[PDB]
């Protein structure tokens with residue numbers, strides 16, 4: 001059981017849908033973490049309480065170096081407190097906007113970390129994680145952290161990242177995460193997702209048909225990987241272990 005008096009509150013880190021996030025320190029260990037404050041009055045005016053309990057339960061159960069850690073939680077009369085991992089280096093999205101695109105070494109490393117995290121998630125029956133750059137955080141050593149918990153969107157999800165099977169109303173499984181990995185790998189190397197278009201309808205047709213092109217700088221190895229991940233038929237997409245064994249990955253991942 002934790003209490004607010006167990007932590008030293010620092011500067012605000014951001015704004016949440018239902019409160020604020022603060023940099024904090026556990027008084028005893030002097031460990032730096034993030035403390036997310038959620039207002040009950042706001043959580044109530046949305047009827048998300050049962051949803052919060054579910055998301056919290058998922059996160060708490062997931063223990064991997066490439067997944068944002070939820071250390072614990074507690075609450076008082078008016079607020080709900082989530083004791084979260086602090087990622088000092090911010091979002092991968094922010095880094096991507098700053099650099100515009102990532103080199104092969106950085107990309108292959110990020111993909112490796114994501115593949116490991118996703119492989120662990122799968123082993124725990126956790127699938128279809130929104131791994132878009134904005135949901136990816138960075139540790140002190142620049143290690144990637146999935147932070148999916150809590151840009152064009154259907155009811156199915158993030159448009160630019162939806163696989164053919166989903167958009168086409170068909171059945172899907174964990175292979176949706178391999179498609180996501182291909183879209184992310186492309187976006188890391190290029191700076192934009194592969195099926196971006198003017199209209200919702202155009203994007204849909206682009207995805208459905210798997211219509212995308214590679215800029216001249218994208219190497220043979222990267223094209224091989226992306227092309228294998230972005231297969232229309234889910235069964236033709238490689239397994240996460242095959243991603244980690246891919247020669248482009250073994251050559252460029254640090």
Ligand SMILES: CCOC(=O)c1[nH]cc2c1NC1=C(C(=O)CCC1)[C@H]2c1cccc(Oc2nc3ccccc3[nH]2)c1
Nearest residue numbers: 013014015016021034055084085086087090147149150
């Ligand atoms: C770079 C410095 O920042 C951090 O290290 C850091 N660590 C955790 C968070 C964060 N920054 C921000 C968060 C926000 O939500 C708003 C914007 C800023 C929050 C956050 C962001 C993403 C995933 C999160 O993780 C979770 N958010 C939850 C909400 C409900 C239930 C369980 C949750 N787990 C939490």
